[PDB]
Amino acid sequence: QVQLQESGPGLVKPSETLSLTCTVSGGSISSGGYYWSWIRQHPGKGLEWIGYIYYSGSTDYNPSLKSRVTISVDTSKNQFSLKLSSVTAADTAVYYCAGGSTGDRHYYYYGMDVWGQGTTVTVSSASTKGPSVFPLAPSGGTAALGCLVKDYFPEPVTVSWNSGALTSGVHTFPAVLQSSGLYSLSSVVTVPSSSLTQTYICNVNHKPSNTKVDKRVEP
């Protein structure tokens, strides 16, 4: 019942140091039942292993990053952390924490069976900016509604509809970097047009700017 959760800033200025933390719940971090790991994913790329840390506190690093990577464990907090110094835009990536059950047939027998959610880190000098949310509203039996989530930085934002009640027929599009340096995306949902008498609310959240906004839609 071990579960993992990344935390840390989503924005890091170039040459500065990236720091992330992974909180383990459901088990002790230095019991020796797991080894722990950081892995990242560049946009459109594969999985890149950053390093391991073991219940003893010893580490193994990716030799290409060893000059600027440190992984550590805080047993009092039941957390393990990542520090990556002198970051460039190449270090922009989704960062995952993960763990692997230790084995007796082979120490790494079970692969990485537990994973965090991943957290997006953008290396940029630009400033954090919260989004603006605008409605999208108007053909026979079904109608389309949406929210336009414009001019924010950095990634990501998240959109749910009616607090996660409405789920089928919802499409939240991949954000697009505009020719201004800010992101923008729409989230749309299709619903029976006879319901236009029911309430549709997009729930927009931008964690790097501590911004949360709900918005209704109707022509």
Binding site: S139, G140, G141, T142
Partner: protein, 208 residues
């Protein structure tokens, strides 16, 4: 798995001239079309034929479903010697709608079909360009004819253009076919007062 269509042209599996009777709901991964294939019995063609052939080539065949159209005040059994089933007949998946008797008034009508399946419905209909104004009046009554076809995607009108074409399969008019892909839960609506070749059944594409 293959199917050798022989005399049957690939688009004829949708409309059903007699040479396609055994392929009305065919199922195959590779489709062998032959140079001798024909799509038609009464002369004519699909107006956008190669695009639809490409679609059907990437299918695993077709499944047919009744569209449930019923009619009053007209005949639905128009038949032609060009479509022979030991006698005069018509396209298997279509209805040649005619005035109740020759030269009689063909009443204004609307029919609508909603796609209640989880996959898009291939909807085909025909426009009849009679050999003459005289013939159009005998089949459908005098006056201008208009066919409109509507869905959430489309709104188009069709007016027949009567006149004598060269005799093909023995006949000088033409019946040309049109297609749309009706999305799940959408409704196609036909409105017409003659010169309309109505679908009896819709087609659903099999996975390849």
């Amino acid at each position: 798995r293959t199917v050798d269509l022989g005399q049957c042209g690939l688009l004829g599996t949708i409309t059903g001239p007699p040479q396609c009777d055994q392929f009305l709901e065919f199922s195959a991964d590779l489709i062998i079309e032959r140079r001798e294939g024909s799509d038609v019995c009464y002369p004519g063609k699909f107006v956008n034929e190669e695009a639809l052939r490409q679609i059907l080539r990437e299918s695993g065949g077709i499944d047919k479903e009744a569209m449930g159209f019923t009619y009053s005040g007209i005949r639905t059994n128009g038949a032609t010697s060009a479509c022979r089933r030991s006698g005069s007949s018509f396209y298997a998946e279509m209805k040649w709608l005619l005035s109740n008797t020759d030269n009689a008034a063909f009443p204004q009508m609307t029919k609508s079909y909603k796609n209640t399946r989880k996959s898009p419905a291939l909807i085909v209909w025909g426009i009849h360009h009679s050999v003459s104004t005289a013939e159009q009046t005998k089949l459908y009554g005098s006056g201008n004819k208009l066919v409109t076809v509507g869905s959430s995607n489309y709104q188009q009108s069709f007016v027949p253009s009567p006149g004598a074409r060269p005799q093909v399969n023995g006949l000088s008019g033409r019946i040309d076919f049109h297609w749309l892909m009706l999305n799940p839960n959408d409704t196609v609506t036909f409105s017409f007062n003659g010169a309309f070749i109505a679908p009896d059944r819709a087609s659903f594409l099999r996975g390849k």
